[PDB]
Design a protein around this ligand. Structure first.
Ligand code: 5R4
Length: 270
Protein backbone atom coordinates (compact mmCIF):
# COMPACT_ATOMS: atom_id res chain seq x y z
CA UNK A 1 0.00 0.00 0.00
CA UNK A 2 1.28 3.43 -1.04
CA UNK A 3 -1.48 5.89 -0.02
CA UNK A 4 -1.83 7.69 -3.34
CA UNK A 5 1.90 7.78 -4.14
CA UNK A 6 1.46 5.07 -6.78
CA UNK A 7 -1.67 3.15 -7.83
CA UNK A 8 -2.78 0.21 -5.71
CA UNK A 9 -0.98 -3.07 -6.33
CA UNK A 10 1.71 -1.33 -8.37
CA UNK A 11 4.65 -0.55 -6.06
CA UNK A 12 6.50 -3.65 -7.31
CA UNK A 13 6.00 -3.64 -11.09
CA UNK A 14 4.77 -0.05 -11.51
CA UNK A 15 1.44 -1.21 -12.97
CA UNK A 16 -1.62 -2.30 -10.98
CA UNK A 17 -1.50 -6.10 -10.84
CA UNK A 18 -4.49 -8.17 -11.98
CA UNK A 19 -5.09 -9.55 -8.47
CA UNK A 20 -5.77 -6.00 -7.22
CA UNK A 21 -9.05 -6.13 -9.17
CA UNK A 22 -10.20 -9.18 -7.18
CA UNK A 23 -9.55 -7.41 -3.85
CA UNK A 24 -9.72 -3.60 -3.95
CA UNK A 25 -11.92 -2.79 -6.97
CA UNK A 26 -15.35 -2.18 -5.45
CA UNK A 27 -17.83 -2.19 -8.36
CA UNK A 28 -20.58 -0.39 -6.44
CA UNK A 29 -18.20 2.44 -5.57
CA UNK A 30 -17.12 2.50 -9.23
CA UNK A 31 -20.69 2.54 -10.56
CA UNK A 32 -21.78 5.22 -8.08
CA UNK A 33 -18.70 7.30 -8.99
CA UNK A 34 -18.54 7.06 -12.80
CA UNK A 35 -22.01 6.09 -14.03
CA UNK A 36 -24.54 8.07 -11.97
CA UNK A 37 -26.74 9.66 -14.64
CA UNK A 38 -28.35 12.00 -12.09
CA UNK A 39 -26.57 15.24 -12.96
CA UNK A 40 -26.43 14.87 -16.75
CA UNK A 41 -24.06 17.86 -16.97
CA UNK A 42 -21.03 16.35 -15.22
CA UNK A 43 -17.68 15.59 -16.84
CA UNK A 44 -18.33 11.90 -16.18
CA UNK A 45 -21.80 12.05 -17.73
CA UNK A 46 -20.33 13.82 -20.77
CA UNK A 47 -17.84 10.97 -21.24
CA UNK A 48 -20.58 8.35 -20.87
CA UNK A 49 -22.84 10.43 -23.12
CA UNK A 50 -20.20 10.39 -25.86
CA UNK A 51 -19.43 6.68 -25.38
CA UNK A 52 -23.12 5.86 -25.88
CA UNK A 53 -23.35 8.23 -28.86
CA UNK A 54 -20.41 6.43 -30.47
CA UNK A 55 -21.74 2.98 -29.55
CA UNK A 56 -25.04 4.10 -31.08
CA UNK A 57 -23.24 5.11 -34.28
CA UNK A 58 -21.32 1.83 -34.55
CA UNK A 59 -24.13 -0.60 -33.74
CA UNK A 60 -27.36 1.00 -34.99
CA UNK A 61 -26.18 3.32 -37.79
CA UNK A 62 -23.16 1.44 -39.19
CA UNK A 63 -23.04 -2.21 -40.24
CA UNK A 64 -21.48 -3.83 -37.15
CA UNK A 65 -23.89 -6.71 -36.46
CA UNK A 66 -23.85 -10.48 -36.41
CA UNK A 67 -24.50 -13.60 -34.38
CA UNK A 68 -22.01 -13.25 -31.51
CA UNK A 69 -20.52 -10.18 -29.83
CA UNK A 70 -17.87 -10.86 -27.19
CA UNK A 71 -17.55 -8.00 -24.70
CA UNK A 72 -14.07 -7.90 -23.14
CA UNK A 73 -13.74 -5.89 -19.95
CA UNK A 74 -17.41 -5.44 -19.12
CA UNK A 75 -16.66 -4.17 -15.63
CA UNK A 76 -19.84 -3.75 -13.60
CA UNK A 77 -21.33 -1.79 -16.50
CA UNK A 78 -23.82 -2.64 -19.24
CA UNK A 79 -24.07 0.74 -21.04
CA UNK A 80 -21.68 -0.56 -23.72
CA UNK A 81 -24.22 -3.24 -24.72
CA UNK A 82 -27.43 -1.19 -25.01
CA UNK A 83 -26.85 -0.27 -28.66
CA UNK A 84 -25.12 -3.54 -29.62
CA UNK A 85 -28.17 -5.40 -28.28
CA UNK A 86 -30.21 -4.14 -31.25
CA UNK A 87 -27.61 -5.64 -33.61
CA UNK A 88 -26.55 -8.98 -32.07
CA UNK A 89 -28.70 -12.01 -31.31
CA UNK A 90 -26.31 -13.06 -28.52
CA UNK A 91 -24.00 -10.99 -26.31
CA UNK A 92 -21.27 -12.46 -24.09
CA UNK A 93 -19.99 -10.33 -21.20
CA UNK A 94 -16.56 -10.98 -19.69
CA UNK A 95 -14.40 -9.45 -16.95
CA UNK A 96 -11.50 -10.34 -14.67
CA UNK A 97 -13.10 -9.06 -11.46
CA UNK A 98 -15.40 -11.54 -9.72
CA UNK A 99 -17.10 -8.64 -7.93
CA UNK A 100 -17.75 -7.11 -11.36
CA UNK A 101 -19.31 -10.35 -12.61
CA UNK A 102 -21.16 -10.50 -9.28
CA UNK A 103 -22.78 -7.11 -9.86
CA UNK A 104 -23.37 -7.96 -13.53
CA UNK A 105 -25.25 -11.15 -12.64
CA UNK A 106 -27.39 -9.20 -10.15
CA UNK A 107 -28.51 -6.89 -12.96
CA UNK A 108 -28.94 -9.71 -15.49
CA UNK A 109 -31.55 -11.25 -13.18
CA UNK A 110 -33.16 -7.87 -12.35
CA UNK A 111 -32.52 -8.15 -8.62
CA UNK A 112 -33.73 -5.14 -6.58
CA UNK A 113 -30.30 -4.53 -5.02
CA UNK A 114 -28.71 -4.34 -8.49
CA UNK A 115 -27.42 -1.01 -9.77
CA UNK A 116 -30.10 1.10 -11.46
CA UNK A 117 -29.26 1.73 -15.13
CA UNK A 118 -32.73 3.07 -15.97
CA UNK A 119 -31.67 6.72 -16.58
CA UNK A 120 -28.86 5.47 -18.83
CA UNK A 121 -31.20 3.12 -20.72
CA UNK A 122 -33.60 6.00 -21.41
CA UNK A 123 -30.93 8.17 -23.07
CA UNK A 124 -29.99 5.33 -25.43
CA UNK A 125 -33.69 4.77 -26.19
CA UNK A 126 -33.81 8.44 -27.21
CA UNK A 127 -30.76 7.93 -29.45
CA UNK A 128 -32.53 4.95 -31.06
CA UNK A 129 -35.47 7.22 -31.96
CA UNK A 130 -37.68 6.02 -29.07
CA UNK A 131 -38.80 2.91 -30.93
CA UNK A 132 -39.05 1.30 -27.47
CA UNK A 133 -39.22 2.34 -23.82
CA UNK A 134 -36.90 1.93 -20.85
CA UNK A 135 -38.19 -1.38 -19.45
CA UNK A 136 -38.60 -3.03 -22.87
CA UNK A 137 -35.01 -2.06 -23.74
CA UNK A 138 -33.50 -3.59 -20.58
CA UNK A 139 -35.39 -6.85 -21.12
CA UNK A 140 -34.09 -7.06 -24.69
CA UNK A 141 -30.50 -6.61 -23.52
CA UNK A 142 -31.03 -9.00 -20.60
CA UNK A 143 -32.33 -11.62 -23.04
CA UNK A 144 -29.33 -11.26 -25.36
CA UNK A 145 -26.61 -11.76 -22.72
CA UNK A 146 -26.30 -15.56 -22.71
CA UNK A 147 -22.97 -15.96 -20.88
CA UNK A 148 -21.06 -14.24 -18.07
CA UNK A 149 -17.47 -15.46 -18.29
CA UNK A 150 -14.11 -14.91 -16.64
CA UNK A 151 -11.60 -12.98 -18.74
CA UNK A 152 -7.83 -12.50 -18.84
CA UNK A 153 -6.30 -10.48 -21.69
CA UNK A 154 -2.76 -11.57 -20.75
CA UNK A 155 -3.60 -15.19 -21.64
CA UNK A 156 -3.34 -16.73 -25.09
CA UNK A 157 -6.86 -18.03 -24.40
CA UNK A 158 -8.58 -14.92 -22.97
CA UNK A 159 -11.82 -16.71 -22.01
CA UNK A 160 -10.09 -19.83 -20.67
CA UNK A 161 -11.18 -23.26 -21.86
CA UNK A 162 -14.76 -22.05 -22.52
CA UNK A 163 -15.52 -22.98 -26.16
CA UNK A 164 -17.35 -20.25 -28.06
CA UNK A 165 -18.04 -19.87 -31.79
CA UNK A 166 -16.02 -17.16 -33.56
CA UNK A 167 -17.63 -13.82 -32.78
CA UNK A 168 -18.62 -11.26 -35.38
CA UNK A 169 -17.48 -8.39 -33.13
CA UNK A 170 -15.35 -7.85 -30.03
CA UNK A 171 -16.08 -4.82 -27.84
CA UNK A 172 -13.82 -3.48 -25.09
CA UNK A 173 -14.73 -0.26 -23.25
CA UNK A 174 -12.23 1.23 -20.77
CA UNK A 175 -10.60 -2.19 -20.30
CA UNK A 176 -7.20 -2.43 -22.01
CA UNK A 177 -5.77 0.74 -20.44
CA UNK A 178 -6.41 -0.74 -17.00
CA UNK A 179 -5.51 -4.33 -17.94
CA UNK A 180 -2.39 -4.03 -20.12
CA UNK A 181 0.68 -2.90 -18.12
CA UNK A 182 2.75 -2.09 -21.23
CA UNK A 183 2.52 -1.75 -25.01
CA UNK A 184 3.78 -5.27 -25.89
CA UNK A 185 1.15 -6.81 -23.62
CA UNK A 186 -1.33 -4.27 -24.99
CA UNK A 187 -0.36 -5.41 -28.49
CA UNK A 188 -0.32 -9.07 -27.45
CA UNK A 189 -3.74 -8.85 -25.77
CA UNK A 190 -5.15 -7.38 -28.98
CA UNK A 191 -3.68 -10.39 -30.79
CA UNK A 192 -5.22 -12.84 -28.31
CA UNK A 193 -8.60 -11.11 -28.63
CA UNK A 194 -8.38 -11.80 -32.37
CA UNK A 195 -8.36 -15.54 -31.66
CA UNK A 196 -12.05 -15.03 -30.73
CA UNK A 197 -12.92 -13.17 -33.96
CA UNK A 198 -14.21 -14.43 -37.29
CA UNK A 199 -11.83 -13.46 -40.11
CA UNK A 200 -12.87 -9.99 -41.21
CA UNK A 201 -14.71 -9.52 -37.91
CA UNK A 202 -14.96 -6.21 -36.10
CA UNK A 203 -12.94 -4.96 -33.13
CA UNK A 204 -14.32 -2.00 -31.18
CA UNK A 205 -12.11 -0.30 -28.58
CA UNK A 206 -12.95 2.83 -26.58
CA UNK A 207 -10.44 3.81 -23.89
CA UNK A 208 -8.62 6.76 -22.36
CA UNK A 209 -5.82 8.71 -24.05
CA UNK A 210 -2.61 9.62 -22.20
CA UNK A 211 -3.86 8.25 -18.87
CA UNK A 212 -1.35 7.09 -16.27
CA UNK A 213 -4.00 6.52 -13.57
CA UNK A 214 -7.68 6.82 -12.72
CA UNK A 215 -9.39 7.29 -9.37
CA UNK A 216 -12.16 5.38 -7.60
CA UNK A 217 -12.76 7.86 -4.81
CA UNK A 218 -9.46 7.62 -2.93
CA UNK A 219 -8.40 4.32 -4.54
CA UNK A 220 -5.89 4.88 -7.35
CA UNK A 221 -5.59 2.39 -10.22
CA UNK A 222 -2.98 2.14 -12.96
CA UNK A 223 -3.74 3.02 -16.57
CA UNK A 224 -1.47 2.63 -19.58
CA UNK A 225 -0.84 6.13 -21.01
CA UNK A 226 -1.32 5.77 -24.76
CA UNK A 227 -1.27 8.20 -27.64
CA UNK A 228 -3.38 7.84 -30.76
CA UNK A 229 -0.28 6.68 -32.66
CA UNK A 230 0.73 4.12 -30.02
CA UNK A 231 -2.85 2.82 -30.11
CA UNK A 232 -3.06 2.80 -33.92
CA UNK A 233 0.32 1.06 -34.17
CA UNK A 234 -0.44 -1.62 -31.57
CA UNK A 235 -3.75 -2.34 -33.32
CA UNK A 236 -2.28 -2.63 -36.82
CA UNK A 237 0.50 -4.83 -35.41
CA UNK A 238 -1.99 -7.23 -33.81
CA UNK A 239 -3.38 -8.19 -37.23
CA UNK A 240 -6.03 -5.50 -37.68
CA UNK A 241 -6.89 -2.82 -40.21
CA UNK A 242 -8.40 0.33 -38.70
CA UNK A 243 -11.70 1.21 -40.38
CA UNK A 244 -12.21 4.46 -38.49
CA UNK A 245 -10.59 6.12 -35.50
CA UNK A 246 -11.91 8.99 -33.37
CA UNK A 247 -10.21 11.12 -30.70
CA UNK A 248 -12.08 13.44 -28.33
CA UNK A 249 -10.79 16.22 -26.09
CA UNK A 250 -13.26 15.84 -23.18
CA UNK A 251 -11.53 14.43 -20.10
CA UNK A 252 -12.58 13.17 -16.69
CA UNK A 253 -12.66 15.57 -13.75
CA UNK A 254 -9.30 16.39 -12.19
CA UNK A 255 -10.29 14.29 -9.17
CA UNK A 256 -10.82 11.18 -11.31
CA UNK A 257 -8.30 10.90 -14.17
CA UNK A 258 -5.27 12.57 -15.76
CA UNK A 259 -6.29 11.47 -19.26
CA UNK A 260 -6.03 13.82 -22.23
CA UNK A 261 -9.23 12.70 -23.92
CA UNK A 262 -10.55 9.41 -25.24
CA UNK A 263 -10.27 7.39 -28.43
CA UNK A 264 -12.78 5.19 -30.23
CA UNK A 265 -12.16 2.91 -33.19
CA UNK A 266 -13.55 0.09 -35.31
CA UNK A 267 -11.05 -2.40 -36.74
CA UNK A 268 -11.26 -5.61 -38.75
CA UNK A 269 -9.08 -8.72 -38.70
CA UNK A 270 -7.05 -9.37 -41.84
C1 5R4 B 1 -14.07 -2.06 -17.87
C2 5R4 B 1 -14.06 -1.13 -16.67
O1 5R4 B 1 -15.09 -0.54 -16.44
N1 5R4 B 1 -12.87 -0.93 -15.82
C3 5R4 B 1 -12.96 0.01 -14.68
C4 5R4 B 1 -12.52 1.34 -15.08
C5 5R4 B 1 -12.13 2.38 -15.49
C6 5R4 B 1 -11.59 3.60 -16.03
C7 5R4 B 1 -12.38 4.78 -16.03
C8 5R4 B 1 -11.93 6.00 -16.52
C9 5R4 B 1 -10.66 6.13 -17.07
C10 5R4 B 1 -9.86 4.98 -17.09
C11 5R4 B 1 -8.48 5.12 -17.68
N2 5R4 B 1 -7.68 6.12 -17.25
O2 5R4 B 1 -8.09 4.31 -18.55
C12 5R4 B 1 -10.33 3.76 -16.58
C13 5R4 B 1 -11.57 -1.65 -16.09
C14 5R4 B 1 -11.59 -3.21 -16.04
C15 5R4 B 1 -10.21 -3.82 -16.41
C16 5R4 B 1 -10.42 -5.29 -16.04
N3 5R4 B 1 -9.17 -6.08 -16.08
C17 5R4 B 1 -8.03 -5.87 -15.25
C18 5R4 B 1 -7.09 -6.81 -15.61
C19 5R4 B 1 -7.61 -7.63 -16.66
C20 5R4 B 1 -7.19 -8.70 -17.44
CL1 5R4 B 1 -5.58 -9.41 -17.20
N4 5R4 B 1 -7.92 -9.28 -18.38
C21 5R4 B 1 -9.19 -8.73 -18.58
N5 5R4 B 1 -9.73 -7.70 -17.91
C22 5R4 B 1 -8.92 -7.14 -16.94
C23 5R4 B 1 -11.12 -5.28 -14.66
O3 5R4 B 1 -11.99 -6.37 -14.55
C24 5R4 B 1 -12.03 -3.99 -14.76
O4 5R4 B 1 -13.35 -4.43 -14.90
Amino acid sequence: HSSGLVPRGSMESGFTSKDTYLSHFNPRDYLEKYYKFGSRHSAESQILKHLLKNLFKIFCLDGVKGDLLIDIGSGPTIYQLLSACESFKEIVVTDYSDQNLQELEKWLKAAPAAFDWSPVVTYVCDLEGNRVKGPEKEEKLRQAVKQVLKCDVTQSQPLGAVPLPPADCVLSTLCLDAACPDLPTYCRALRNLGSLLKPGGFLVIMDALKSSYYMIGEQKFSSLPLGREAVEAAVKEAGYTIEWFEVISQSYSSTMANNEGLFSLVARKL
